[PDB]
Design a protein around this ligand. Structure first.
Ligand code: LU8
Ligand code: LU8
Ligand code: LU8
Length: 284
């Protein structure tokens, strides 16, 4: 039989220290192609090892298609091929788009659903998985209004470091219990709470909305250092601002409470992804 492997690379949709992401075409269909830098080869190996262990399939997880290694004259070329989401990342989407109650809840409940799916061990099934770099750039928006979680290059399984702006206090103060898988779930819940803040700001109530800002925009520089983050999060124990206008809206009042239960200094006090889902299903 003929095994069609040609992918036409059409448009670069992302370039960074990680490498590049391209919109590509296989057999008439859009795919996304991540081409890894030499600097980030271990992220390709980790995501490939995970998908060789468990073929994750969930509506709120970016859909895997292929991992390809190709021999070149003097180098190895590493590609990850996934489903393509033309609306782009949640980070991108929130820059100009505002939300209503239904769209805001649908976004955040879809993220919580993908995250609970990663976290929960299924017997017979899948190992428990923690993501370790959850943020709005690692979430894609689908045409149906739900999102999906991307980038398992730092993921850990149980049966590069995270983006510093989103690091939990125990990562910044190096107290994290590294031999305990639950520690890594609790670092993802902290980062989830920051994403929930970023999205809620863009939900309109009584004619008011906040501009898009990243977490801690008002207290750290761009590309904040590890020390900049530690002083804010660990020493001063700052948390993102909840605007007064949220307390006139029942949805944003409930979301403020939720985000505050993702941000406890004590990791074991934070809500679980399953409890976040249940709370979101009871809002509105
Ligand atoms: C090697 O590389 C790539 C391959 C492909 C691809 C292209 N056509 C057909 C296939 C195919 C799938 C599955 C079977 C099965 C049939 C049932 N039988 C019992 C076991 C075998 C055969 C063939 C593949 C996997 C796409 C690629 O990119 C999108 C590849 O590059 C990453
Ligand atoms: C990698 O990705 C894509 C792959 C393909 C594709 C191409 N040839 C053959 C297949 C295939 C056929 C048959 C089985 C068998 C498995 C065992 N048993 C006997 C029942 C069924 C498995 C695989 C596929 C899945 C199509 C795709 O899209 C249309 C892909 O997505 C981009
Ligand atoms: C986060 O990480 C990964 C993401 C993706 C990925 C999947 N679908 C779509 C995208 C995308 C498409 C289009 C735009 C732009 C271009 C047009 N318009 C002006 C604004 C929107 C942005 C983004 C990406 C980047 C793939 C990955 O791997 C193959 C990723 O890494 C795991």
């Amino acid at each position: 039989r003929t095994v069609a492997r040609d992918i036409t690379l059409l448009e670069c949709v992302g370039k960074g220290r990680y490498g590049e992401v391209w919109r590509g075409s296989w057999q008439g269909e859009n795919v996304a192609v991540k081409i890894f830098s030499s600097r980030d080869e271990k992220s390709w190996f980790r995501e490939t090892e995970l998908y060789n262990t468990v073929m994750l399939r969930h509506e709120n997880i970016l859909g895997f298609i292929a991992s390809d290694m190709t021999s070149r004259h003097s180098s190895t070329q590493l590609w990850l091929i996934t489903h393509y989401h033309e609306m782009g990342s949640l980070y991108d989407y929130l820059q100009l788009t505002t939300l209503d109650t239904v769209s805001c809840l649908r976004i955040v409940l879809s993220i919580a659903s993908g995250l609970a799916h990663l976290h929960i061990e299924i017997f017979g099934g899948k190992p428990a998985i923690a993501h370790r770099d959850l943020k709005s750039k690692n979430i894609l928006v689908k045409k149906n209004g739900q999102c999906c979680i991307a980038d398992l290059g730092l993921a850990v399984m149980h049966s590069r470091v995270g983006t510093k702006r989103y690091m939990a206090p125990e990562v910044l103060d190096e107290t994290i219990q590294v031999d305990c898988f639950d520690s890594y779930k609790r670092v993802d819940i902290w980062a989830f709470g920051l994403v929930l803040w970023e999205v809620a700001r863009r939900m309109v109530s009584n004619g008011i909305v906040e501009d898009y800002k990243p977490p801690f925009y008002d207290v750290v520089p761009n590309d904040p250092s590890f020390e900049d983050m530690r002083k804010v999060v660990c020493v001063d124990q700052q948390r993102p601002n909840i605007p007064n206008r949220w307390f006139s809206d029942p949805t944003l009042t409930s979301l403020a409470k939720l985000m505050k239960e993702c941000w406890y200094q004590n990791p074991s006090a934070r809500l679980t992804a399953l409890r976040i889902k249940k709370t979101l299903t009871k809002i509105d």
